[PDB]
Enzyme design. Structure first.
Site, short mmCIF file in Angstrom:
data_model
loop_
_atom_site.label_atom_id
_atom_site.label_comp_id
_atom_site.label_asym_id
_atom_site.label_seq_id
_atom_site.Cartn_x
_atom_site.Cartn_y
_atom_site.Cartn_z
N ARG A 71 6.28 -7.96 -2.60
CA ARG A 71 5.61 -6.68 -2.41
C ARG A 71 6.38 -5.81 -1.42
NH1 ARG A 71 0.55 -4.25 -2.59
NH2 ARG A 71 0.92 -2.04 -2.15
N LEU A 106 -6.30 3.08 -2.27
CA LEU A 106 -5.39 2.03 -2.69
C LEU A 106 -4.33 2.62 -3.62
CD1 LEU A 106 -7.89 -0.88 -3.48
CD2 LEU A 106 -6.44 -0.66 -1.47
N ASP A 107 -3.07 2.31 -3.34
CA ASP A 107 -1.99 2.76 -4.21
C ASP A 107 -1.99 1.96 -5.51
OD1 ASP A 107 -1.42 0.59 -2.53
OD2 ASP A 107 0.74 0.76 -2.92
N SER A 108 -1.30 2.51 -6.52
CA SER A 108 -1.27 1.85 -7.82
C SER A 108 -0.65 0.46 -7.73
CB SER A 108 -0.50 2.71 -8.82
OG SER A 108 0.85 2.88 -8.42
N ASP A 136 -1.26 -1.60 -5.54
CA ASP A 136 -2.39 -2.46 -5.23
C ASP A 136 -3.33 -2.62 -6.42
OD1 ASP A 136 -1.46 -2.90 -2.70
OD2 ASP A 136 -2.89 -1.58 -1.69
#
Ligand SMILES: CCCCCCCCCCCCCCCCCC(=O)OC[C@H](COP(=O)([O-])OCC[N+](C)(C)C)OC(=O)CCCCCCCCCCCCCCCCC
Ligand SMILES: CCCCCCCCCCCCCCCCCC(=O)OC[C@H](COP(=O)([O-])OCC[N+](C)(C)C)OC(=O)CCCCCCCCCCCCCCCCC
Ligand SMILES: CCCCCCCCCCCCCCCCCC(=O)OC[C@H](COP(=O)(O)OCCN)OC(=O)CCCCCCCCCCCCCCCCC
Ligand SMILES: CCCCCCCCCCCCCCCCCC(=O)OC[C@H](COP(=O)(O)OCCN)OC(=O)CCCCCCCCCCCCCCCCC
Ligand SMILES: CCCCCCCCCCCCCCCCCC(=O)OC[C@H](COP(=O)(O)OCCN)OC(=O)CCCCCCCCCCCCCCCCC
Ligand SMILES: CCCCCCCCCCCCCCCCCC(=O)OC[C@H](COP(=O)(O)OCCN)OC(=O)CCCCCCCCCCCCCCCCC
Ligand SMILES: CCCCCCCCCCCCCCCCCC(=O)OC[C@H](COP(=O)(O)OCCN)OC(=O)CCCCCCCCCCCCCCCCC
Ligand SMILES: CCCCCCCCCCCC(=O)OC[C@H](COP(=O)(O)OCC[N+](C)(C)C)OC(=O)CCCCCCCCCCC
Ligand SMILES: CCCCCCCCCCCC(=O)OC[C@H](COP(=O)(O)OCC[N+](C)(C)C)OC(=O)CCCCCCCCCCC
Ligand SMILES: C[C@H](CCC(=O)O)[C@H]1CC[C@H]2[C@@H]3[C@H](O)C[C@@H]4C[C@H](O)CC[C@]4(C)[C@H]3C[C@H](O)[C@]12C
Ligand SMILES: *C(=O)CCCCCCCCCCCCC
Ligand SMILES: [Zn+2]
Lengths: 55, 171, 122, 12, 128, 459, 55, 88, 156, 174, 55, 64
Positions: free
Chosen positions: B37, H42-44, H46
Site C-alpha cells: 500500500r 476514504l480514498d478509492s 481504500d
C-alpha cells in the site's frame, strides 16, 4: 523428507519475501507439458483438418 | 476502455490478490499488504500524466515477473473449481409451458401465479418498446445501458430475462 | 555397493564380471569339492507345483512350509518356524553366492599379480 | 424452503 | 531487471504489457467508442427479439449464416490454381499416398521373399 | 424370392387404395410384416447357399443385407411423417411409392444370380434415389447434389456394363454359380488391367473410395431424412456387395492392382475422419463418417482374407444401423431449430434428457465400443490388415483416436454445455422420435448376442 | 498397510541387476512422497484458520 | 448445499461488522447509507480493500467493473443479495 | 430471410467494396482486414485476431456465455477451433520459448542418464544363482530324450 | 458320460486328504455343509423333477452322415455337376478340419491350466500334438484366400508336391 | 518398463511438491505410486506390484 | 426383515440359478470348468485311491 519438509514449511511463516525461481515455476506448471502439448498438438491437428484435409 | 484511474485500481487489486497467494498466512499478508500500500502511496497524487503512465507501465512489468504461477481463485469464479458447476441444473422458465396438464395439476398454486407474471409481461411489452423507441438517438443506441421506468406503473424495459433468470442453486 | 565404484571408476580387469562369472574352473583350488546335496526330488517339487524359480537347493524347506500352511489354516499366524527355516536356508544360499563373487574377485587379482612379475622381469 | 424446481417435462 | 515478454501464436501478449493500451490518443478514443456503437446497435436488435413475449423459435443470426457459408460454399469460387495452392495440394494430397505405397510395397516385397525362402516363422499362423 | 418381391409390390396398391389418413399406418404396419418374414432367409447351410431358381439366390452375404434393407422401410416411413405432414396427399403417396420401388430394386439386387441382372437392378436404384433427393430435399443444393450423385455413378457403371458383356462373350455365362466353377486366372496384360478397373470402379465410386467421394457429402446431406437413411445404410453397401462378388473373377490380378486403392483408403480414413473434427454442419459430419467407415470395407475386400471378409460384412451391417440412427438423431434437432449448424443449439441434454441417451449410445457404437458389432467388424479388419502388413496398425490406430474425438465432440457440442438462450421451441421428444431410435439401437445391440448371422459366407 | 508392499519393493529394487539411474530416481521420489504428504498436513490441519468467517 | 441460506438482515449485519473492524472508519457515524468517499473520507485505494474484505467474507469474487461502483454498505448488501438469490 | 447481398463474396479490390464488406460484417472499416488474396478461398471474410475464446472477458454479459460471443458479432474463421474446449491462446506466466527449452532439456537430460545407467548397471556382489540338476533342464521345457550337458554346482 | 473321454481326456484326480494341525475350526468345512444343504439339495430336487418329465416324452435326434463322393481330382474340367458335389464335400471337410484344430487347442489350454506351475514339462505331449495338427492344417488350407475352393487347394497341393519331388533329387545327388 | 516407471514416479512426485489444490496433490500422488508399481514390474517383481495395488 | 429379504432375492435365488446352470449345463461339457490340480506334498494321502506319498529325505542339519 519429513525433516526437510518441516523446515521448508516453517520458513513460510517467516516475514521474508518471495523470489520465484525457475525450478518452482517448472513444478507448479507441471513441467509445461500440459501447456505446450495441449496447445501445440490440438493446434497442429485442428489446423490441418480444416486447411489441408477439408479446404 | 479503462481510464488511468481504473487501471491503477485494478492493478492494486491484482497485486494484493497474488501477494495474498504467496503469503498464505494472514499475519504475513497483513504485513506486505501495508508495505505494498505504501508503494501505491508514494505516488498517490502524481501530477504529470506522462510520468504517471510510466509508473503504471513499470508496475505491470514488476507484477508480471512477480505474479504467482498458480494464483488463488474463488471456487465459483472463472477458472475456479466450482465455476459453472450448476449450469446443468439451470433450466429456463419457458420449459414449463411444455408441461403436460397432469404435471401442472401437481402445482396448482405455482402455475396460477405463473400465469399472472405472463400476463404482466404481455401487457407491459408494447409500452416497453415505445419507452426505448423514443429515448434512442436518431441513429441508434451508443451504449448498452437501459433506462429505468419513468411513469408510475411501468416496468423497466427489457426486464423479463433478468428477473425470471434461474437461481444460482436451482436444485 | 562399493564394488560398483571399482569396476567402473577404476581398474576393471580385477573386478568380477557378473554376467560372465565364474571364469576359473571350480577345481582351481579346493583339492576336492562336494557337489551340492539336493534334498528334494524332481517329482516332489513337480507335485508341489513350486514356481520354477523356487525349485532351488532350498526347496525342501519351502515344501515343508507350504504343507504346514495348508494344514494350519485358518491359523495364518502359525507355521512361523517353518518360514524362518526356509528363509535361513535362502540366507545361507545367498552367502555362498557372495563367497563365489569373492573367489572370482581374488582369483582375478592373481592374474594381475602373477603377470607383472612375468612381464616386468621379461 | 421447498422452492419450485424448474425442470423440463418428464411426462413424455 | 524485468525480462521482456515474448509472445507467440499460442501465447498472446498480455493486455497489461501491450504499448497500444497505454498510448491513448484522440483517434484511438474515437475508435473505441465507435466500436461500442456497433456492439450496442447489434445488442439492441437482438434484445428486441429475445425479450419479445410472442416470439417462439430461433433468432436467425446472420453472422452465423455467413460463417458456415464462408467455410463451405464460398471456398471454391475464391480459389485460383497458382503456385502456392498447387504445391500445397500436390505434397499434401499426393505426397502421403506415394510415401505409404513404398512403405507397404517394400514391406510386402521383403516379407514375400522370406516366405518363399521358407525363413519366416509361420509355425502357428493359420488365421489370416 | 417371390415371397418377398410380391408383398413389396402390394405395398403400392395398399398405399394408393388406403384411407387418406391411414397411408402411414397401413404402409408402416405391412412393411413391418414383410420385415418379419425376411427372417426365413436365415435357412443357410455351411456348404451350399440357398439357390431358389434360375434368377434369384440367397447366401450368408446377401441375407443380412436383405434383412437390413427390409427393416429400414418401416423406419424410413416413421422418419418422414413429420416433415411431409403439410404435403399434398397425392405427393405424399408418391414419396412412399419411391421408397417401395427402392426396396423392390434392392431386394432383387442382393439376390440376383446373374451379374447382368444385378447390373440392371443395381442401376435402377438411382432413379427413385435421384427423385427423392431433388423433389423432397429442402435446400437449393439438392439439385446439384442429384447431378453429382447421378453422374458419378454412371461414369463408373457404364464401363462395368461393357466389362460384364465382354466376360459373358468369353466365359459364356454370367450366372454367379457358374462363375465359381468356370472361373479362370487373369493373365497380367494391359487388356486385363483395364478389365479390372472397369469391373471395380463402379463399386468403389458407390462405396465411396476416397477421392471419388465428393458426391456423398452433397447427396447424403441435401436429401430428406428417408433419403439419407437409405443412402447411407443400404446404398453404400451395393458397392461393397458388388466387390465381394466380382473379385471372384479377378484373381490373381487383384494382388497388385489393389495397392493404389488400399493406399487411398488407408490414408483416406485419416483425412475423412479429420474433416469431421472441423465440420460446422452436423449432418455433414455424419456424412463424412461414412466415408471413413467404408474405407475399412474397401481395404478388407481388396486384401481377400477370410478374416477381412468376415469383418467387412459385419461392418456394413453395423454401419447401416449406426449411420441411419445418427441421421435420425440429427434430423430430430433440425425439425425443432430448422438449421443444420452444429453450434446453433447446445446444451440439449438439459432440455431433452432421454434423447441425449440415444446420442450417447449412437456415439458409442460409432466409435466402436466393444463388444458392439461395430467393434467386432472393425477389429476383424484390423487383425487381417496387420497380417497383410504390420505397419498398417499405425494407420488403423490413428483413425481410432480420431474417430473417438469427432464422435464425442459431436456429443459434447450439441448436448452438453449451456443451452442457447434464444432457442425456446425445443418441445419434449415425441413418442415417434423415441421409438425410431429404439428401433435402430436395440437390433444393433441384440446382434452382439448372436454375431454369427452377420459374419458372411466365410464364417 | 503401505509398509508391507512399498518397503519390499524398495529393498528389491536396490538388490537387483537394474538400471542405476532408474534406481536413483525411485529413491528421490520416495523423499518427495514425505514432502507433499507433509504439505497436506501442515497447510490443512496445523497453523491458524484461513477460511471464511462463516463456515 | 447444506449451508444455511443467507438473509437480508444477516448480510447487512456482516457487511457492517466488517466495516466496524476497519480502523479508518469510525463506528459511531457508520450507517447503511454512509457513502464511503463523501461521508467517511476514504480514498478509492481504500475502497478496493473494502470490496476485497467483502469477497473474503462471503467467499465470492466481485468483478472490478462492479466493485468500483459500490460506494455504500447498503449497495453492497443489494449486490450480494442479488448474486445469491436472497429475497427475504 | 437472408440474401446474396449479405453473404461473403470475393476479395474486395476497390475501396468502395472494402466499406461495403465492413458494413456487411458489422465491423468498422478501419477494423476490417481480409485475408491475403492467395487463392486459398478466404474471399472477403474478415481476418479477425487469432485469439481463443478463453481470452474474452468472462464477466461481460455475452449473448452466448459459454462461447463468449454476441449475436451479430462476426465469428473468427477458426471459431470452432478456439472454443473453450480446444486450442487455448491465453498469456502464460512463462515465455513460450523458455518453456520449450526447460521441457526439452528435462526430457533430453533424463533420456541420456537412462542410457548411461543402462550401460553402468547396479548389481549386488553375488555370483549367478545355482539351480539343481541340469539347471532344471526337464522342468523348464527340455527334451527328455536329449542328454543335457551336466551342470554341476559345488560348495565353498 | 455326457461327453466322450477319449476325445477330451482328463487325467486321474489325486486329491490330498485333510490333515489339520490346528484347534480352530475350518470355515470352509462349515460353509461347504451349509452350501450342500441350502444350495445343492433344492437344486437337485428341481432337476430330478425335470428329469422325470423328460423320460415320459423321450424322443431322439440323429447325426447326419454324408457318403463320400468323387473329389475334385476326379472331375473333368468345366464339369459343373461333378465339380459341384466335389466342392460341397471339400467345404464340409474344411469345416470339420477347423473343429479338429479347435479340439486339440482345447486340450492344450486345459492342460496348461490343470498342471499349474509345472505345465512346461507336464503338457509336452499336448503341445506336440498341437504343433502337428497345426502344420497339417496350414499345409492344406493356408494362403488360399477368401475365395478358396477345392481347385485352389488342389493347385496348392500340387505345388507342394513338385517342391518335395524337386527336393528328393537334390537330396540323392551325391 | 523400469525406465518408464522411474521417470513417472519422479516427475509426478516433483509436481506435487508445489500444488495448492488438495485433490491434485493426491492425484499426482497416485501417479507417483503407479510409477513405483511399474518400476516393480521392471525389476521382475510382478507379485510385489500386485500387492502394492491392493495395499 | 429387510436384510433377510435381500439375502433371499439377491444371494439365495441367484446362487440356486448359478448352481443349476453350472451343475447340469456348464459342467456337463468338456473342458468348461478346469480346476488346477490340487497340490501334493510329501506325506499326503490321496482320497481317491488311498495312496500314500513317501516322506522326503532326511534333512541333515541347520539348527539356526
Ligand atoms: C489408368 C492407368 C494409366 C497408366 C498409364 C501409365 C503406363 C505406364 O506407366 O506403364 C509402364 C510401367 C511398365 O512396367 P510394367 O512392366 O509393370 O507394366 C505392366 C506390365 N504388364 C504389361 C505385364 C502388365 O508400368 C507400371 O508399372 C507403371 C505404373 C504406374 C502407375 C501410376 C498410376 C497410379 C494411379
Ligand atoms: C499414436 C499417435 C496417435 C495419433 C493421435 C495422437 C497424437 C496427437 C494428435 C491428437 C490430439 C489432437 C486432437 C484434436 C484436439 C481435440 C481435443 C482438444 O481440443 O484439446 C483441448 C485440450 C485442452 O485441455 P487442457 O486441460 O490442456 O487445457 C484446457 C484449459 N483449461 C485447463 C483451463 C480448462 O487438450 C487435450 O485434452 C488434448 C491433449 C492431448 C494431445 C497431445 C497428445 C500428446 C501425446 C503424447 C506425446 C508423447 C508421446 C508419448 C508416447 C505416446 C505416443 C506413442
Ligand atoms: C519417456 C519420454 C516419452 C516422450 C514424452 C516427452 C515428449 C515431449 C518432448 C519435449 C517436447 C518439447 C516441445 C518443443 C517443440 C516446440 C515447437 C515450437 O516451438 O513451435 C511453436 C511455434 C512458435 O512459433 P511463433 O509463435 O510464430 O513464434 C516463435 C515462438 N517460439 O508455433 C507453432 O505452433 C507452429 C508449429 C510448427 C511446428 C512445430 C514443430 C512440430
Ligand atoms: C503434380 C506435380 C506438379 C506440381 C506443381 C504444380 C504446377 C506449378 O507449380 O505451376 C504453377 C501453375 C502456374 O501458376 P502461376 O504461374 O503462379 O499463375 C497462373 C495461375 N494459373 O499453376 C497453375 O496455374 C495450374 C496448376 C495445375 C496443377 C494441378 C496439379 C496439382 C494439383 C494438386 C494435386 C491433385 C490433388 C490430388 C489429391 C488426391 C488425394 C486427396
Ligand atoms: C468411375 C468414375 C470416376 C470418374 C468420375 C468423375 C466425376 C464425374 C464427372 C463429374 C459429373 C458432373 C458433375 C455435375 C456438373 C454440373 O452440375 O455442372 C453444373 C454447371 C452449372 O451450370 P448449369 O447448372 O447448367 O446452369 C444452371 C444453374 N442452375 O453446368 C455446366 O457447366 C455444364 C456441364 C455439362 C457437363 C456435365 C454433364 C456431363 C458429365 C459427364 C461427362 C461427359 C462425358 C465426357 C465427355 C465425353 C467426351 C466428349
Ligand atoms: C479420366 C479418364 C480416363 C479414361 C480411361 C479410358 C481407358 C480406355 C481403355 C481402353 C480399353 C482397353 C481395351 O480395349 O480392352 C482390352 C481388350 C481389348 O482387346 P480384346 O479383343 O478384348 O482382347 C481379348 C479378346 N479375347 O478387351 C478386354 O480384354 C476386356 C476389357 C473390357 C473392359 C471394359 C471396357 C474397357 C475398359 C473401360 C475403361 C476402364 C477404366 C474405367 C474407369 C472408369 C472411370
Ligand atoms: C482422386 C482420384 C482417385 C481415383 C484414382 C483412380 C484409381 C487409380 C488409377 C488406377 C491405377 C492402376 C495402375 C494401372 C497401371 C498398370 C499397373 C501395373 O501393371 O503394375 C504392375 C506392377 C508389376 O507387379 P509387381 O508390383 O512388380 O509384383 C507382382 C509381379 N507379378 O505392379 C505395380 O506396379 C504395383 C501396382 C501399380 C502401381 C501402384 C502405384 C501406386 C502409387 C500411389 C497411388 C496413390 C493413388 C494415386 C491417385 C492420385 C489421385
Ligand atoms: C532435492 C531437494 C528438493 C527440495 C524440495 C522442496 O522442498 O521444494 C519446495 C518447493 C516449494 O516449496 P513451497 O512450500 O511451495 O514454497 C514456495 C514459496 N511460498 C511458500 C512462498 C509460496 O518446491 C519446488 O520448487 C521444488 C521443485 C524442484 C524439485 C527438484 C528438481
Ligand atoms: C375388366 C376391365 C377393367 C379392369 C379391371 C378393373 C377392376 C376394378 C374396377 C374399378 C372399381 C372401383 O371403383 O374400384 C375402387 C376400389 C377402391 O374403392 P374406392 O371407393 O375407390 O376407395 C378409394 C379410397 N381412397 C379414395 C381413399 C383412395 O379399388 C379397387 O378395388 C380397384 C382394383 C384394385
Ligand atoms: C436391506 C436394504 C437396506 C437395509 C439397511 O441397510 O438398512 C434395503 C434398502 C432398499 C431395499 C430394496 C428396495 O426397496 C427395492 C426392492 C423392494 C422389494 O422389497 C424387493 C427387494 C428390493 C430390492 C429391496 C431389498 C432390501 O430390502 C433393500 C435393499
Ligand atoms: C550397491 O549395492 C548399489 C547401491 C545403489 C543404491 C544406493 C545406496 C547407497 C550406496 C552408498 C554406497 C555405500 C558404499 C559403502
Ligand atoms: Zn420442422
Amino acid at each position: 523428507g519429513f525433516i526437510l519438509a518441516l523446515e521448508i514449511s516453517n520458513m513460510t511463516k517467516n516475514l521474508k519475501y518471495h523470489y520465484p525461481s525457475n525450478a518452482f515455476k517448472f513444478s507448479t506448471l507441471l513441467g509445461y507439458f500440459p501447456t505446450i502439448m495441449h496447445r501445440l498438438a490440438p493446434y497442429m491437428n485442428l489446423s490441418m483438418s480444416q486447411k489441408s484435409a477439408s479446404s | 476502455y479503462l481510464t488511468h484511474q481504473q487501471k491503477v485500481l485494478r492493478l492494486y487489486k491484482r497485486a494484493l490478490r497474488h501477494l495474498e497467494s504467496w503469503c498464505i498466512h494472514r499475519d504475513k499478508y497483513r504485513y506486505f499488504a501495508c508495505l505494498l500500500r505504501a508503494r501505491f502511496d508514494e505516488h498517490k497524487n502524481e501530477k504529470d500524466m506522462v510520468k504517471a503512465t510510466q509508473l503504471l507501465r513499470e508496475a505491470e512489468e514488476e507484477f508480471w515477473h512477480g505474479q504467482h504461477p498458480q494464483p488463488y481463485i474463488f471456487p465459483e469464479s472463472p477458472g475456479g473449481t466450482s465455476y459453472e458447476r450448476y449450469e446443468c441444473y439451470k433450466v429456463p422458465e419457458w420449459c414449463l409451458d411444455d408441461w403436460h396438464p397432469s404435471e401442472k395439476a401437481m402445482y396448482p398454486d405455482y402455475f396460477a401465479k405463473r400465469e399472472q407474471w405472463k400476463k404482466l409481461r404481455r401487457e407491459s411489452w408494447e409500452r416497453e418498446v415505445k419507452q426505448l423507441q423514443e429515448e434512442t438517438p436518431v441513429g441508434g443506441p451508443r451504449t448498452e445501458a437501459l433506462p429505468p421506468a419513468r411513469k408510475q406503473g411501468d416496468l423497466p424495459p427489457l426486464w423479463w430475462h433478468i428477473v425470471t433468470r434461474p437461481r444460482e442453486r436451482p436444485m | 555397493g562399493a564394488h560398483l565404484a571399482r569396476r567402473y571408476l577404476g581398474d576393471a580387469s580385477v573386478e568380477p564380471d557378473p554376467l560372465r562369472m565364474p571364469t576359473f574352473p571350480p577345481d582351481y583350488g579346493f583339492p576336492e569339492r562336494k557337489e551340492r546335496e539336493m534334498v528334494a526330488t524332481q517329482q516332489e517339487m513337480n507335485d508341489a507345483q513350486l514356481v520354477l524359480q523356487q525349485r532351488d537347493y532350498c526347496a525342501h524347506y519351502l515344501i515343508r512350509f507350504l504343507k504346514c500352511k495348508r494344514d494350519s489354516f485358518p491359523n495364518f499366524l502359525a507355521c512361523k518356524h517353518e518360514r524362518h527355516d526356509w528363509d535361513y536356508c535362502e540366507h545361507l544360499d545367498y552367502v555362498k553366492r557372495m563367497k563365489e563373487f569373492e573367489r572370482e574377485r581374488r582369483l582375478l587379482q592373481r592374474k594381475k599379480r602373477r603377470e607383472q612379475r612375468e612381464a616386468d622381469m621379461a | 424452503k421447498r422452492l419450485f424446481i424448474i425442470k423440463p417435462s418428464g411426462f413424455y | 531487471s524485468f525480462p521482456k515478454y515474448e509472445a507467440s501464436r499460442l501465447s498472446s501478449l498480455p493486455t497489461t504489457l501491450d504499448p497500444a493500451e497505454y498510448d491513448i490518443s484522440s483517434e484511438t478514443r474515437k475508435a473505441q467508442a465507435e466500436r461500442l456503437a456497433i456492439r450496442s446497435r447489434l445488442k439492441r436488435e437482438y434484445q428486441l427479439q429475445y425479450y419479445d413475449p410472442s416470439r417462439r423459435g430461433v433468432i436467425e443470426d446472420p453472422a452465423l449464416v455467413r460463417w458456415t457459408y464462408a467455410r463451405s460454399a464460398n471456398i471454391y469460387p475464391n480459389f485460383r490454381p497458382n503456385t502456392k495452392t498447387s504445391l500445397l495440394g500436390a505434397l499434401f494430397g499426393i505426397g502421403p499416398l506415394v510415401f505409404w505405397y513404398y512403405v507397404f510395397k517394400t514391406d510386402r516385397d521383403r516379407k514375400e521373399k522370406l516366405i518363399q525362402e521358407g525363413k519366416l516363422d509361420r509355425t502357428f499362423n493359420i488365421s489370416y | 424370392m417371390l415371397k418377398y418381391i410380391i408383398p413389396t409390390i402390394m405395398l403400392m396398391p395398399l398405399t394408393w387404395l388406403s384411407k387418406n389418413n391411414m397411408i402411414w399406418v397401413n404402409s408402416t404396419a405391412h412393411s413391418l410384416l414383410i420385415s418379419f418374414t425376411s427372417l426365413l432367409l436365415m435357412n443357410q447351410f455351411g456348404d451350399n447357399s440357398l439357390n431358389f431358381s434360375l434368377l434369384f439366390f440367397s447366401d450368408s452375404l446377401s441375407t443380412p443385407l436383405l434383412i437390413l434393407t427390409m427393416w429400414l422401410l418401416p423406419l424410413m416411413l416413421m422418419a418422414s411423417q413429420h416433415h411431409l405432414s403439410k404435403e399434398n396427399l397425392t405427393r405424399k403417396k408418391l414419396f412412399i411409392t419411391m421408397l417401395i420401388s427402392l426396396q423392390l430394386f434392392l431386394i432383387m439386387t442382393f439376390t440376383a444370380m446373374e451379374l447382368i441382372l444385378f447390373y440392371i437392378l443395381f442401376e435402377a436404384t438411382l432413379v427413385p434415389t435421384l427423385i427423392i433427393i431433388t423433389r423432397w430435399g429442402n435446400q437449393t443444393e439438392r439439385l446439384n447434389a442429384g447431378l453429382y450423385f447421378l453422374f458419378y455413378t454412371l461414369a463408373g457403371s457404364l464401363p462395368l456394363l461393357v466389362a460384364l458383356i465382354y466376360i459373358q462373350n468369353t466365359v459364356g455365362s454370367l450366372n454367379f454359380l457358374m462363375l465359381q466353377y468356370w472361373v479362370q486366372p487373369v493373365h497380367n496384360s494391359w487388356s486385363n488391367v483395364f478389365m479390372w478397373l472397369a469391373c471395380m470402379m463402379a463399386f468403389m465410386v458407390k462405396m465411396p473410395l476416397y477421392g471419388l467421394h465428393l458426391w456423398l457429402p452433397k447427396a447424403h446431406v441435401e436429401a430428406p431424412i428417408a433419403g439419407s437413411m437409405v443412402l447411407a445404410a443400404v446404398l453404400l453397401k451395393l458397392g461393397g456387395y458388388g466387390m465381394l462378388r466380382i473379385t471372384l473373377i479377378l484373381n490373381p490380378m487383384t494382388d497388385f492392382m489393389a495397392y493404389p486403392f488400399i493406399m487411398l483408403s488407408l490414408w483416406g480414413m485419416i483425412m475423412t475422419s479429420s474433416i469431421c473434427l472441423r465440420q460446422t454442419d452436423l449432418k455433414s459430419l455424419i456424412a463424412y463418417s461414412s466415408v471413413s467407415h467404408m474405407a475399412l470395407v474397401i481395404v478388407a475386400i481388396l486384401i481377400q482374407t477370410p478374416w477381412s471378409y468376415m469383418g467387412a460384412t459385419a461392418l456394413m451391417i453395423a454401419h447401416g444401423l449406426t449411420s441411419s440412427m445418427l441421421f435420425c438423431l440429427a434430423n430430430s434437432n433440425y425439425e425443432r431449430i430448422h438449421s443444420r449448424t452444429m453450434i446453433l443449439a447446445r446444451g440439449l441434454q438439459t432440455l431433452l434428457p432421454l434423447m441425449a441417451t440415444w446420442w450417447l449410445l449412437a456415439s458409442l457404437t460409432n466409435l466402436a465400443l466393444p463388444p458392439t458389432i461395430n467393434l467386432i467388424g472393425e477389429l476383424f479388419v484390423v487383425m487381417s490388415t496387420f497380417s497383410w502388413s504390420n505397419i498398417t496398425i499405425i494407420l488403423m490406430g490413428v483413425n481410432m483416436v480420431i474417430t473417438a474425438l469427432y464422435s464425442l465432440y459431436m456429443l459434447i457440442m450439441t448436448q452438453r454445455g449451456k443451452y442457447t438462450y434464444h432457442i425456446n421451441n425445443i418441445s419434449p421428444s415425441f413418442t415417434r422420435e423415441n421409438a425410431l431410435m429404439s428401433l435402430h439401437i436395440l437390433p444393433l445391440l441384440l446382434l452382439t448376442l448372436n454375431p454369427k448371422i452377420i459374419l458372411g459366407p466365410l464364417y | 498397510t503401505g509398509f508391507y508392499s512399498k518397503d519390499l519393493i524398495i529393498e528389491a529394487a536396490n538388490t537387483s541387476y537394474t538400471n542405476a539411474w532408474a534406481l536413483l530416481m525411485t529413491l528421490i521420489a520416495t523423499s518427495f512422497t514425505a514432502i507433499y504428504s507433509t504439505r497436506i498436513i501442515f497447510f490443512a490441519l496445523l497453523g491458524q484458520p484461513r477460511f471464511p468467517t462463516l463456515v | 448445499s447444506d449451508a444455511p441460506p443467507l438473509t437480508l438482515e444477516g448480510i447487512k449485519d456482516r457487511v457492517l461488522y466488517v466495516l466496524k473492524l476497519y480502523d479508518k472508519i469510525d463506528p459511531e457515524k457508520l450507517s447503511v447509507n454512509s457513502h464511503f468517499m463523501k461521508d467517511l473520507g476514504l480514498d478509492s485505494l481504500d475502497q478496493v480493500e473494502i470490496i476485497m474484505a467483502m469477497e473474503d467474507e462471503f467467499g465470492f469474487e466481485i468483478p472490478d467493473i462492479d466493485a468500483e461502483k459500490l460506494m455504500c454498505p447498503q449497495e453492497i448488501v443489494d449486490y450480494i443479495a442479488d448474486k445469491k438469490d436472497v429475497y427475504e | 430471410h437472408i440474401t446474396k447481398d449479405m453473404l461473403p463474396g470475393p476479395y474486395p479490390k476497390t475501396p468502395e467494396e472494402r466499406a461495403a464488406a465492413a458494413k456487411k460484417y458489422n465491423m468498422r472499416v478501419e477494423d476490417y482486414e481480409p485475408y491475403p488474396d492467395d487463392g486459398t478461398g478466404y474471399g472477403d471474410y474478415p481476418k479477425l485476431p487469432d485469439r481463443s475464446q478463453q481470452e474474452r472477458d468472462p464477466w461481460y454479459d455475452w449473448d452466448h456465455p459459454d462461447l463468449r460471443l454476441n449475436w451479430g458479432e462476426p465469428m473468427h474463421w477458426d471459431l470452432d477451433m478456439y472454443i473453450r474446449n480446444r486450442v487455448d491462446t491465453s498469456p502464460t506466466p512463462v515465455n513460450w520459448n523458455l518453456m520449450c527449452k526447460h521441457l526439452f532439456g528435462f526430457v533430453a537430460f533424463m533420456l541420456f542418464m537412462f542410457w548411461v545407467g543402462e550401460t553402468y548397471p547396479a548389481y549386488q556382489p553375488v555370483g549367478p544363482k545355482q539351480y539343481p540338476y541340469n539347471n532344471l533342464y526337464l522342468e523348464r521345457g527340455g527334451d527328455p530324450n536329449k542328454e543335457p550337458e551336466p551342470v554341476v554346482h559345488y560348495e565353498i | 458320460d455326457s461327453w466322450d473321454k477319449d476325445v477330451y481326456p482328463e487325467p486321474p484326480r489325486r486329491t490330498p486328504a485333510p490333515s489339520p494341525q490346528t484347534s480352530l475350526p475350518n470355515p470352509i468345512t462349515y460353509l461347504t455343509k451349509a452350501f450342500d444343504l441350502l444350495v445343492d439339495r433344492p437344486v437337485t430336487l428341481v432337476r430330478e423333477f425335470i428329469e422325470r418329465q423328460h423320460a415320459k416324452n423321450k424322443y431322439y435326434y440323429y447325426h447326419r452322415e454324408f457318403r463320400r463322393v468323387p473329389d475334385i481330382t476326379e472331375c473333368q474340367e468345366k464339369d459343373v455337376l461333378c465339380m459341384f458335389e466335389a466342392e460341397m464335400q471339400w467345404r464340409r471337410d474344411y469345416k470339420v478340419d477347423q473343429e479338429i484344430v479347435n479340439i486339440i487347442q482345447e486340450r492344450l489350454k486345459a492342460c496348461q491350466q490343470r498342471e499349474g506351475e509345472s505345465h512346461r514339462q507336464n503338457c509336452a505331449k499336448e503341445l506336440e500334438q498341437f504343433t502337428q495338427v497345426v502344420k497339417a492344417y496350414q499345409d492344406r488350407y493356408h494362403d488360399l484366400g477368401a475365395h478358396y475352393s477345392a481347385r485352389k487347394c488342389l493347385a496348392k497341393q500340387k505345388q507342394r508336391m513338385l517342391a518335395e519331388r524337386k527336393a528328393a533329387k537334390e537330396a540323392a545327388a551325391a | 518398463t523400469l525406465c518408464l516407471g522411474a521417470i513417472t514416479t519422479l516427475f509426478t512426485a516433483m509436481c506435487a511438491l508445489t500444488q495448492n489444490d488438495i485433490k491434485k496433490i493426491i492425484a499426482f500422488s497416485t501417479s507417483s505410486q503407479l510409477g513405483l508399481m511399474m518400476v516393480t514390474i521392471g525389476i521382475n517383481q510382478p507379485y510385489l506390484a500386485f500387492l502394492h495395488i491392493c495395499t | 426383515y429387510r436384510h433377510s429379504i435381500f439375502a433371499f432375492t439377491h444371494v439365495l435365488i441367484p446362487v440356486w440359478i448359478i448352481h443349476y446352470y453350472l451343475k447340469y449345463h456348464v459342467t456337463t461339457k468338456p473342458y468348461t470348468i478346469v480346476e488346477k490340480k490340487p497340490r501334493i506334498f510329501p506325506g499326503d494321502t490321496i482320497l481317491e485311491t488311498g495312496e500314500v506319498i513317501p516322506p522326503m529325505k532326511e534333512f541333515p542339519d541347520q539348527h539356526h
